[PDB]
């Protein structure tokens, strides 16, 4: 319950939006043709690494 609201404002950081937008720019690249195994685990690692950094700075105040 505090995690799902702390994770909300951590996405509108400018370091986290341009890790999100070309994750979804590559979404319509995989299901377009048949000659591909271009996965999206590289595009999602940079999202979660930029995001979960700022979550750890703030989450432990709202707990215990």
């Amino acid at each position: 319950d505090p995690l799902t609201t702390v994770r909300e404002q951590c996405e509108q950081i400018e370091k986290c939006i341009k890790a999100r937008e070309r994750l979804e720019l590559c979404d319509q690249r995989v299901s377009s043709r048949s000659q591909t195994e271009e996965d999206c685990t590289e595009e999602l690692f940079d999202f979660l690494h930029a995001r979960d950094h700022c979550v750890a700075h703030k989450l432990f105040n709202s707990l215990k």
């Binding site: 319950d1 505090p2 995690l3 799902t4 994750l23 590559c26 979404d27 690249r29 995989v30 299901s31 591909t36 195994e37 271009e38 996965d39 999206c40 685990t41 590289e42 595009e43 999602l44 690692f45 979660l48 690494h49 979960d52 950094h53 979550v55 750890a56 700075h57 989450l59 432990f60 709202s62 707990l63 215990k64």
Partner: protein, 241 residues
Amino acid sequence: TDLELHAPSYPWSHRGLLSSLDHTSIRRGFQVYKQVCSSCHSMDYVAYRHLVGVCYTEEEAKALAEEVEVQDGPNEDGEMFMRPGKLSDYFPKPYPNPEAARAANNGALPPDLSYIVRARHGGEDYVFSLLTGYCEPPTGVSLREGLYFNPYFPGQAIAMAPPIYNEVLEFDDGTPATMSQVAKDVCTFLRWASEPEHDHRKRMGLKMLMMMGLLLPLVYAMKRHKWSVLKSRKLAYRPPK
């Protein structure tokens, strides 16, 4: 070919050099192990004599191991006479067919937990960041049926289905049982389990630093006193001309 994700740094309440453990968050964290799991994970090195003093007095530890019923030894004309557990026990173990119980888990056996934060490259920051970090499988990643996409896993597809939602549990004192109050208490557990000497070596480290603050400038004063004879001497050369 793909990269890996490492857990960030969480400001634990025992992260400092002279910081103790919180003795209420281990009390709440034993029960996130006691009745959310032990259906997959043993902890084959901790007993209920290890829980008295840390977080219980002995009566609340005596009342447990009577929620479990394990198989004791033999007698004459009875064969495997049993009992509920004593407090000197590794209380149950989970699944039979040992080391091949992966048929219950689709070819991947979950490991023991009594040394799991010492055995990882993240400590208890890794256990927290994987237990609360499930995602949906992204585009192009095909999954064998029985795999769940966890980005904090080396193989990127753990056979772990997520074990916690919100209020799988309710504590004894009255505490909200959200998914982050969960897994913060069981990660203050599983670290005391790996290192039960945590608060004892930090209090002994304080007494060491105060004695060496007395013993060292005084031995350096005795050395400085003897060596001042050589440090102050003068030399002269007077040959016959």
